[PDB]
Design a binder for these strands. Structure first.
Ligand SMILES: [Mg+2]
Ligand SMILES: [Mg+2]
Ligand SMILES: [Mg+2]
Ligand SMILES: [Mg+2]
Ligand SMILES: [Mg+2]
Ligand SMILES: [Mg+2]
Ligand SMILES: [Mg+2]
Ligand SMILES: [Mg+2]
Ligand SMILES: [Mg+2]
Ligand SMILES: [Mg+2]
Lengths: 293, 170, 159, 213
RNA sequence: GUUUUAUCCGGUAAAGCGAAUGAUUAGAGGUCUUGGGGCCGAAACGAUCUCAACCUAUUCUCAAACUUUAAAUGGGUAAGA
RNA sequence: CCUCCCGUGGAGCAGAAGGGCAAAAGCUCGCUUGAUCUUGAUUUUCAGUACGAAUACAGACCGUGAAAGCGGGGCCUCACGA
RNA sequence: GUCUACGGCCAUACCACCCUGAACGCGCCCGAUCUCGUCUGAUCUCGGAAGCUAAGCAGGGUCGGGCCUGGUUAGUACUUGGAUGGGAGACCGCCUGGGAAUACCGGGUGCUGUAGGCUU
């Protein structure tokens, strides 16, 4: 070329790489510093954050506090363990986000032994609710939402998970502006379409809307809903009994697997002797090719 | 034999009309683009002030709009019909996407209107493969990798197979 | 004839090290500072708030007050022929724990454990660390090898 | 018009280069630093002879110009215009100043003496250390005496003490003359113009197989 | 107005410029261009010769208000009731 | 003007220079008035006086943000008066 | 032996190109009724699950560049303290202690914390 090579030797010599998770595009350190750092006059009082991460096929809800050697996770809930009871299809939606936030809330409260107190909002409605600490009793668990790189506009599944947790009984500071019920025009919160979103009524309306226009498009969209026959009329009761089962048993038990032979699926790193031998063989073969001409 | 995830396809079409000045001419050009695309266009301010072209900084100069999907396919079809399905060898960039220009906007479908000029325009189609969106996504963005890229030769070949075009030795 | 600006002569003092610019690592915030512990004041330039003055860069002091983002440090400053204990408010980005104190307290704990163990097992043991003693008598074997004879090399002009 | 060089012989100041702070510097007297057959290849001129300072001092650009001219004239006389290549290894980067006084019969005429005494740029000199090379001449191996005489004649244009040294390197390269031939044979060195390129045994093997081919 | 043992602090001397920022010498190898042009090329400089600019790998010499690296001397703290 | 690719910042951050900064401290939007009411402590010049400027708090009342938080002028070093 | 989520240190981790990827996963992918944003459902937000490892990603490779760490450079350069040492000076040697940096030549190419999966 005739243009200066921008990425020459000196460019790499002076290049400073960013943090590993910044390069991976996973952690916003500007938000993390404000989010995980405790006041110095609070010393070793942990600062709890509820990490919510919505995946292409899963929802991860975790509660963690920062330490020097790394974040310490005290409770984790996933949307892939929702099929253990109630909802089995249509995960990674708003209703499953509410369910997994509620499951995380109940599981953490059960681990800490605060269940009879801080029952949360058992009767589900979309209106705001904030648990209040009972005097003479252990205080309500307080954590702060970690949305990550998600765009926190109205109707986000991270706020669905937050609503699930605050209905489960955690004291998470929030507002109703980002719930799906909020009207950005009149600056008002409907608190009923939010309950519809929590119970998955929008998805059911989509199903019965697709049925009346394009049946094959309905099949293509809700293909797995057809399997095991999840229908719009029973979706809300499915979610209600899923919430009931979450409240009934939030304890997680692990799945054991140890009878696995130690098989390696990766190529090991070559040794220095092997690399030198490879270079020598390549030189010899090149000279052989020349002498054969 | 060929992975279905490697198929070339049009990402955007990126129509652009660069009227020299602002005002009624620019408004009529915006009406032209909206009529052609069925889609509201946007204006472009002038980055600097140049006396030779007689434009001031922050003055609305051009109008443009990006079109994606089947509408992009149809608009590109009309533009190439006007171009007689022939393009110069140098009309293709080294990044795998290309473009051309149309002198009069009424020879492609749109009928003349007396309250509308004879505006010309620029087509610049951007090719792509499934998975190019990872360079634009917010969380865990990354580059596409060398084999997944599109070369000038591949763009020319795709033009020849799809629109049975002629690559003139320009 | 010198200006009295707060940051005169800090061009390299408050500049970042090579290829260590950008985001401040979060362990510096995750450290814990109690009252009475010993900290070194450094003063990085990425954080412009709560900066120490240039006369406290490289000094070492004792923490007496802890706030949300800073600490109060009692640090000795020499002015003419007197040393006075100044009290400075410094944000935690500009400080770190002094390892001399950590090593000393580990030594104290280890010496107390040694006293307990030695009183358990009867035999006395040495705790005061002594300076480097003179080398003791020893034999140096030749291993049947005559030592190499060394002579100075002749001079020659090189370049 | 110019002060005696004894006034600026010693390195008394910090280096004062021509920069954005030292403005208005007149051009140096020496503009050409390489003479003779500069295009000659490496093997053409095996012998290299340097002239090496023995004093930490300042050499003026005028002195460098005079010595270059003298050595060039003698080398052209003895070895011919294509038989040698000379390189001046000192560049006059240090600006020397002058606090000009009015050279009339009056001190009342705004002379001010030592007030505001910082001076205007007088000229440029080069700083040379003990052991540093001032001039280099490379040529055929049989012109050793001519090189020595040219450097001896050039010595008289400089203030201090200088030595003449027939270096052990091949030409202007940094490799020893006795080890040069076999290194070129085994392709640790590749000629290019007046110098050679050292080819280490690391890098891509494509650069190795463009060699040996 | 001291050493020792731990432990931090620094950007001077030196060094570097085939490492950034400025300064600067010479050749070498490539191929685009409003470089000159080039001798027989208008004719498709049918051609390809030279000099530019540019790029690449090198090369000579430098910095109080340049720097990756980086001393000696030096500054702080600790060595318990 | 429009499009793609490279781009460690070689731009910008009011101004002198130096430092600092990249899903920043830069650019563009949205909402705003913490450039507000208060008491002390401290740092800088220093005599350890003042002014100026600054740092960390505490008590009000607010702003913004979903929130953690951040904000009592300007990213820091000057821009002032018994 | 690995991956996911959140990380600590922040290139032994970066950059360029090539090869391989079982299972979960992560992704690409499909769509725009609802939530929400656009000139454009490209990004963002939402509802999904036909196909695919082509890309991201992971592991490996390159007499690779860089980076990290050694050897050399070199007890050299520089330097604390000393002398009624040398020299016209410039500067230099010695005594007493400390002691570098290029070029050049080697080796290495992330380690690890918490929680949860996959691997007969
Ligand atoms: Mg944010
Ligand atoms: Mg005279
Ligand atoms: Mg002087
Ligand atoms: Mg200094
Ligand atoms: Mg120096
Ligand atoms: Mg340089
Ligand atoms: Mg307050
Ligand atoms: Mg401020
Ligand atoms: Mg390498
Ligand atoms: Mg010595």
């Amino acid at each position: 070329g005739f243009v200066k090579v921008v990425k020459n030797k000196a460019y790499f010599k002076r290049y400073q790489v960013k943090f590993r998770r910044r390069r991976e595009g996973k952690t916003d350190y500007y938000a993390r510093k404000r989010l995980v750092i405790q006041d110095k006059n609070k010393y070793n009082t942990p600062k709890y954050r509820m990490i919510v991460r919505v995946t292409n096929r899963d929802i991860i809800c975790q509660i963690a506090y920062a330490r020097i050697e790394g974040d310490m996770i005290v409770c984790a809930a996933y949307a892939h363990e929702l099929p253990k009871y109630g909802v089995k299809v249509g995960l990674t939606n708003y209703a499953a986000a509410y369910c997994t936030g509620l499951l995380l809330a109940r599981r953490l409260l059960n681990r800490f032994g605060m269940d009879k107190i801080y029952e949360g909002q058992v009767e589900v409605t979309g209106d705001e609710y904030n648990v209040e600490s009972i005097d003479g009793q252990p205080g309500a668990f307080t954590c702060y939402l970690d949305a990550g790189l998600a765009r926190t506009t109205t109707g986000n599944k991270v706020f669905g998970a937050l609503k699930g947790a605050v209905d489960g009984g955690l004291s998470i500071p929030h507002s109703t502006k980002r719930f799906p019920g909020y009207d950005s025009e009149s600056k008002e919160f409907n608190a009923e379409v939010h309950r519809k979103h929590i119970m998955g009524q929008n998805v059911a309306d989509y199903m019965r809307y697709l049925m009346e226009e394009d049946e094959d498009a309905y099949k293509k969209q809700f293909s797995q809903y057809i399997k095991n026959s999840v229908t719009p009329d029973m979706m809300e009761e499915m979610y209600k009994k899923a919430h009931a089962a979450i409240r009934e048993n939030p304890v997680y038990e692990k799945k054991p697997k140890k009878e696995v032979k130690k098989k390696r699926w990766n190529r090991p790193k070559m040794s220095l002797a092997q690399k030198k031998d490879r270079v020598a063989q390549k030189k010899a073969s090149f000279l052989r090719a020349q002498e054969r001409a | 034999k060929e992975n279905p995830m490697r198929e070339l396809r049009i990402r955007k079409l990126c129509l652009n009309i660069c009227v020299g000045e602002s005002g009624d001419r620019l408004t009529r050009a915006a009406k032209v683009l909206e009529q052609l695309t069925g889609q509201t266009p946007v204006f472009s301010k002038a980055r600097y002030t140049v006396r030779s072209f007689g434009i001031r900084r922050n003055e609305k100069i051009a109008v443009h709009c990006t079109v994606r999907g089947a509408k992009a396919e149809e608009i590109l079809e009309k533009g190439l019909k006007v171009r007689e399905y022939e393009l110069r060898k140098n009309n293709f960039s080294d990044t795998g996407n290309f473009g051309f220009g149309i002198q009069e906007h009424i020879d492609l479908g749109i009928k003349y209107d007396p309250s509308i000029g004879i505006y010309g325009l620029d087509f610049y189609v951007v090719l792509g493969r499934p998975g190019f969106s990872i360079a634009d996504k917010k969380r865990r963005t990354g580059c596409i990798g060398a084999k997944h890229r599109i070369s000038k030769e591949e763009a020319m070949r795709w033009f020849q197979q799809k629109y049975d075009g002629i690559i003139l030795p320009g | 004839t010198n200006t009295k600006g707060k940051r005169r002569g800090t061009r390299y003092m408050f500049s970042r090290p090579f290829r260590k610019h950008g985001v401040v690592p979060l362990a510096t915030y995750m450290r814990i500072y109690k009252k009475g512990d010993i900290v070194d004041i450094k003063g990085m330039g990425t954080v412009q708030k709560g900066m120490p003055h240039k006369c406290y860069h490289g000094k070492t002091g004792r923490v007496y007050n802890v706030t949300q983002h800073a600490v109060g440090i009692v640090v000795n400053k020499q002015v003419k022929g007197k040393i006075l204990a100044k009290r400075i408010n410094v944000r935690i980005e500009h400080i770190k724990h002094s390892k001399s104190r950590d090593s000393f307290l580990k030594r104290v704990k280890e010496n107390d454990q040694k006293k307990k163990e030695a009183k358990e097992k009867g035999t006395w043991v040495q705790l005061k660390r002594q300076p480097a003693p003179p080398r003791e008598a020893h034999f140096v074997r030749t291993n049947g090898k005559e030592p190499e004879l060394l002579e100075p090399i002749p001079y020659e002009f090189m370049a | 018009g110019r002060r005696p060089a004894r006034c600026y012989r010693y390195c008394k100041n910090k280096p004062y280069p021509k920069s954005r702070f030292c403005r208005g510097v007149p051009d140096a007297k020496i503009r050409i630093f390489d003479l003779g057959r500069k295009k000659a290849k490496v093997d053409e001129f095996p012998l290299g002879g340097h002239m090496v300072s023995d004093e930490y001092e300042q050499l003026s650009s005028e002195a460098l110009e005079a010595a270059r001219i003298c050595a060039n004239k003698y080398m052209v006389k003895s070895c011919g215009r294509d038989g040698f290549h000379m390189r001046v290894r000192l560049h006059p980067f240090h600006v020397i100043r002058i606090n000009k006084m009015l050279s009339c019969a009056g001190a009342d005429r705004l002379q001010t003496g030592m007030r505001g005494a910082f001076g205007k740029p007088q000229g440029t000199v080069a700083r040379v250390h003990i052991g540093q090379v001032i001039m280099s001449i490379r040529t055929k191996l049989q012109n050793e005496e001519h090189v020595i005489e040219a450097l001896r004649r050039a010595k008289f244009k400089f203030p201090g003490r200088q030595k003449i040294h027939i270096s052990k390197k091949w030409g202007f390269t940094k490799f020893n003359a006795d080890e040069f031939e076999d290194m070129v044979a085994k392709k640790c060195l590749i000629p290019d113009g007046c110098g050679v390129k050292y080819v280490p045994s690391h890098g891509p093997l494509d650069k190795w197989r463009v060699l040996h081919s």
